[PDB]
């Protein structure tokens, strides 16, 4: 039902199909055990009212509240999925169980829970963000030298940086505050500013649709991370614990990015309780990286030994030589 | 040898300066690195990098036609018709008449938004009265 | 509406890659230059360099050669440089 | 293995927050890389 609502919104840029996913990302994915029946009932009656209202205006705008043509297919699928979920919740025992006080209590128990099932999903968040970055940079060739994509990639870089910052300090209140800001920012900027300036209708820009979809995926991952909590060990590198060809090659590929490794080291140093200058930090990181690569090569040459100075196999020699030749 | 000596002397002098500095402003032990200097250096590196990579990616008046002219000709002979107009038969569309223009294309399917890019000034009309000005002297 | 009057992408990309390669020098080859940075009490090496300069100023080139040989041998062995740049605490 | 051990201990101590041990271990690592002979003596094959 989450995916069908997100798709209904990606196919229609109205304001009601915009009001609903905000409640999805701020109320559904933040309840502790599971979303309450109140939210499901509200979503059901909201889809009902939307279907009714979109029907009346077939007799007789600038924002694109409705087109008044074609089908209401997506609303039908949305309602059917909501009722399906309600029915299979009632099949189990999950169903059936002035305004500042409830929100205060809710956010308080979310920030200070009785128990926290701590887990780390930060790597998935960063993978979603870097896929979004690949999309936003390859959009240069097709959609918003242009103007809007500049500030778009700028705020993307900024949100990635501040997200890593929030992750290092293992803060939760900061994470929920950042989620609340970022959801409103992204939605308003994507459905009230982008479709107007140097842009056709949003329902025809596929790149923006994929960007929005992966950003909703990132929003869901961040909401999950908030719901569970943060562990106590968030310092070790992501892929330095196997000593294998996969680790070695992925680590080399990670180091091949021009402005990523040193930026990573600086960002780790600036938000970590340490007592070393920046130069000492850089020296330690350099030493650790080289020693790790050497350890990987040592383990490799241990696992696949060669007896003595017989030869170097003609296959690998020819391969490397031809590779260097074709590269040159 | 001269270059080696100068290099050694420069590096040793810089190291001596840093030693004297860390002697004059000591810090007790591994308490912390003050958040102020850490934030300062981090933000400085960040703004330097974004200025290096981003700033290279940084980078109307209405008019009216003074003369209009039309020429119709047959094959490769002298033109049979030629006519020009200037500032008198050039009508700027009256605002009310411009509104009747706007709604005149009501039953049109998808050419109204094409003209909605303009205003009542960048669209004018040119009248060409009757006969041809020049003769026909083949 | 006439507006008043108002390749390089390749050069931009090239200079960005070159600047990235240059920045990498501050992070990939630092462990190599540790024998010449973490030095406490460098007063003796600075003394030797100042004596070299003073002898060169005077014109007694034999002492200049001797002191230059001493400095070269100092930088030609890390262990004697450690033994030579101790903290000298008394 | 020993240098990797030392770096991992540095990282773990930094994670915990006992910065005195961090300073001691960083000094040890700096002195390790500040003399090749003790690095040879410290990275022997350790065959038994």
């Amino acid at each position: 039902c989450y995916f069908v609502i997100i798709l209904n919104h990606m196919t229609s840029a109205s304001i009601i199909t915009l009001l609903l996913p905000i409640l999805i990302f701020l109320w559904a994915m933040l309840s502790v055990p599971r979303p309450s029946r109140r939210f499901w009932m509200m979503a059901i009656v909201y889809t009902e009212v939307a279907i009714v209202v979109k029907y009346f205006f077939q007799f007789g705008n600038i924002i694109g509240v409705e087109k008044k043509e074609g089908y209401v297919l997506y609303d039908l699928i949305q309602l059917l999925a909501l009722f399906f979920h309600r029915s299979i919740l009632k099949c189990h025992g999950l169903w059936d169980e002035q305004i500042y006080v409830p929100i205060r209590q809710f956010f308080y128990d979310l920030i200070h829970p009785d128990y926290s099932a701590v887990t780390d999903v930060y790597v998935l968040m960063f993978l979603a963000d870097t896929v979004d970055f690949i999309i936003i940079v390859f959009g240069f060739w097709a959609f918003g030298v242009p103007g809007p994509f500049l500030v778009m990639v700028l705020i993307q870089f900024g949100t990635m940086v501040v997200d890593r910052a929030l992750y290092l300090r293992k803060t939760v209140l900061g994470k929920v505050i950042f989620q609340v800001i970022l959801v409103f920012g992204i939605h308003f900027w994507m459905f009230f500013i982008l479709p107007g300036v140097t842009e056709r209708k949003f329902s025809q820009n596929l790149v923006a649709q994929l960007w929005y979809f992966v950003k909703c995926v990132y929003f869901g991952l961040s909401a999950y991370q908030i719901r569970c909590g943060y562990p106590t060990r968030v310092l070790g590198n992501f892929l330095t614990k196997s000593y294998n060809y996969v680790n070695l090659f992925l680590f080399q590929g990670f180091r091949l990015v021009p402005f990523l490794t040193e930026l990573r080291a600086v960002m780790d140093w600036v938000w970590t309780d340490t007592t070393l200058s920046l130069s000492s930090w850089i020296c330690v990181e350099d030493i650790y990286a080289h020693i790790f690569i050497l350890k990987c090569w040592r383990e490799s040459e241990k696992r696949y030994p060669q007896p003595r100075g017989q030869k170097k196999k003609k296959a690998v020699k020819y391969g490397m030589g031809g590779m260097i030749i074709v590269l040159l | 040898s001269w270059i080696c000596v100068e290099d050694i002397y420069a590096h040793i002098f810089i190291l001596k300066c840093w030693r004297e500095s860390e002697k004059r402003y000591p810090q007790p032990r591994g308490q912390k690195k003050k958040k102020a200097v850490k934030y300062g250096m981090g933000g400085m590196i960040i703004v330097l990098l974004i200025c290096i990579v981003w700033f290279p990616l940084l980078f109307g008046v209405i008019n009216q036609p003074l003369d209009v002219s039309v020429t119709i000709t047959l094959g490769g002979y002298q033109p049979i018709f030629t006519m020009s107009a200037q500032q008198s038969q050039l009508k700027v569309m009256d605002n009310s008449k411009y509104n009747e223009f706007l709604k005149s294309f009501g039953p049109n399917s998808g050419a109204m938004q094409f003209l909605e890019n303009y205003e009542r000034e960048d669209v004018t009309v040119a009248e060409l009265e009757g006969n041809s000005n020049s003769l026909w002297t083949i | 509406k006439v507006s008043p009057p108002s390749g390089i992408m390749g050069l931009y990309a090239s200079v960005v890659l070159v600047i990235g390669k240059f920045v990498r020098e501050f992070f990939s080859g630092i462990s190599h230059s540790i024998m010449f940075e973490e030095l406490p009490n460098v007063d003796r090496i600075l003394k030797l360099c100042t004596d070299i300069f003073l002898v060169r100023e005077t014109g007694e080139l034999e002492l200049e050669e001797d002191l230059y040989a001493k400095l070269i041998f100092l930088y030609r062995s890390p262990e004697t440089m450690i033994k030579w740049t101790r903290e000298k605490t008394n | 293995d020993r240098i990797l051990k030392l770096c991992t201990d540095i990282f773990l101590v930094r994670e915990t927050g006992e910065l005195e041990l961090e300073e001691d271990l960083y000094a040890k690592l700096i002195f390790l890389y500040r003399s090749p002979e003790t690095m040879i003596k410290w990275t022997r094959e350790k065959t038994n």
């Binding site: 007592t275 000492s280 | 860390e22 002697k23 000591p26 810090q27 007790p28 032990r29 591994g30 | 973490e38 406490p40 903290e87 | 300073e23 001691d24 960083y26 000094a27 040890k28 700096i30 002195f31 390790l32 500040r34 003790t38 003596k41 410290w42 350790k46």
Partner: peptide
């Protein structure tokens, strides 16, 4: 002192003990 102790390395750190 911070700067005094951060550079307090010597040979006796790398002894052949390896006390396992």
């Amino acid at each position: 002192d911070h700067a005094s102790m951060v550079r307090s390395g010597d040979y006796y750190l790398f002894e052949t003990d390896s006390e396992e």
